[PDB]
Amino acid sequence: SMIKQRTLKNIIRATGVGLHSGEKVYLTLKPAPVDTGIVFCRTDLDPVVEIPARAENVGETTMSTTLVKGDVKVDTVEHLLSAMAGLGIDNAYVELSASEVPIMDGSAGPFVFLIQSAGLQEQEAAKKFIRIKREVSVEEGDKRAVFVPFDGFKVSFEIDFDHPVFRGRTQQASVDFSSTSFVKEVSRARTFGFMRDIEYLRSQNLALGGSVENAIVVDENRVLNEDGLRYEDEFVKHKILDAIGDLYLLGNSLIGEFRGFKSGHALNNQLLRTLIADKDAWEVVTFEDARTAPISYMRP
Numbered sequence: 212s213m214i215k216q217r218t219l220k221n222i223i224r225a226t227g228v229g230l231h232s233g234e235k236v237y238l239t240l241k242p243a244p245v246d247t248g249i250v251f252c253r254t255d256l257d258p259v260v261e262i263p264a265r266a267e268n269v270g271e272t273t274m275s276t277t278l279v280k281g282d283v284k285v286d287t288v289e290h291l292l293s294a295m296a297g298l299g300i301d302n303a304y305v306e307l308s309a310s311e312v313p314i315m316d317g318s319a320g321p322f323v324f325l326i327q328s329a330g331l332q333e334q335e336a337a338k339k340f341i342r343i344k345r346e347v348s349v350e351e352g353d354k355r356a357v358f359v360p361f362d363g364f365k366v367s368f369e370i371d372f373d374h375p376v377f378r379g380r381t382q383q384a385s386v387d388f389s390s391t392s393f394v395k396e397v398s399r400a401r402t403f404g405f406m407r408d409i410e411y412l413r414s415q416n417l418a419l420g421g422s423v424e425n426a427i428v429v430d431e432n433r434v435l436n437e438d439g440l441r442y443e444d445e446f447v448k449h450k451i452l453d454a455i456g457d458l459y460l461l462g463n464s465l466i467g468e469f470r471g472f473k474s475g476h477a478l479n480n481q482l483l484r485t486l487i488a489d490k491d492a493w494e495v496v497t498f499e500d501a502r503t504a505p506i507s508y509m510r511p
């Protein structure tokens with residue numbers, strides 16, 4: 212059988228708060244037709260504003276990835292999109308009653324569980340992949356983000372925090388999803404912030420919804436969360452989760468390899484824009500036989 216596009220098999224509902232705005236928000240995920248892509252919808256507005264989750268609609272990348280259309284924004288899309296990418300969802304409507312996606316527990320875990328509880332639905336159209344044909348690299352300062360050709364999907368990231376909790380730890384990780392499960396090894400990795408910054412962030416209307424229930428809080432010499440970490444390398448694994456979500460703004464699953472060095476949402480988006488512009492470096496492919504494809508997906 213061909214690798215088919217996927218949507219949701221049932222409507223999903225969740226309530227939460229935006230990490231940065233602190234606003235209560237109702238999230239509804241709905242099935243969508245073939246070739247829709249992932250589309251965010253601000254249903255608190257009338258008429259609604261619908262914003263496709265595509266690189267061309269990224270309008271801001273400070274702290275989190277933000278989609279913009281007209282005067283309207285949808286903040287912090289990366290963790291939800293990481294779950295969508297991790298589960299291979301092509302088409303979905305994402306309804307929000309406020310401007311920011313709920314942070315949940317700070318990871319993609321709750322979204323992944325809500326989606327897999329609803330189930331996925333294959334659709335009668337070939338799933339389209341973007342295959343990297345040539346290396347594409349962007350840099351700014353000491354930050355770097357690269358796409359290289361690779362027969363599969365692989366993401367590597369390196370952080371370099373000048374901080375006592377990070378020095379001497381695993382600050383580089385590589386995940387090849389032919390041998391590593393997105394669900395078990397990436398999806399549960401939570402976002403993190405530094406205690407030293409919280410008052411300043413709040414003074415800028417940032418991290419207003421943050422709590423130890425949705426973020427790892429790193430103090431000057433210790434992790435504050437009394438219940439501990441989920442992974443010894445949870446920090447760099449969360450950066451990989453972020454990269455997977457930002458990369459899904461291409462609108463299709465990737466066949467290739469990503470390597471990031473201190474690359475945040477801004478440089479991730481610049482990599483996507485450079486790749487899209489360099490049309491010699493990529494192609495759209497489909498698979499008439501899932502058995503011969505370089506990527507495989509779980510049953511729906």
Ligand SMILES: C[C@@H](O)[C@H](NC(=O)c1ccc(C#Cc2ccc(CN3CCOCC3)cc2)cc1)C(=O)NO
Pocket residue numbers: 274275276289290402403404405409412418420421422423426428435449453
């Ligand atoms: C990883 C990045 O790349 C990015 N995350 C961020 O920028 C980011 C994340 C989280 C936060 C936060 C927070 C916060 C936590 C708790 C409290 C209240 N507590 C009261 C009791 O004592 C302790 C404090 C207040 C605020 C701030 C910033 C990302 O994940 N992007 O996707």
Ligand SMILES: [Ca+2]
Pocket residue numbers: 271272273274275277
């Ligand atoms: Ca921002």
Ligand SMILES: [Cl-]
Pocket residue numbers: 354473474475476477478479
């Ligand atoms: Cl950046």
Ligand SMILES: [Zn+2]
Pocket residue numbers: 289290402449453
């Ligand atoms: Zn994140």
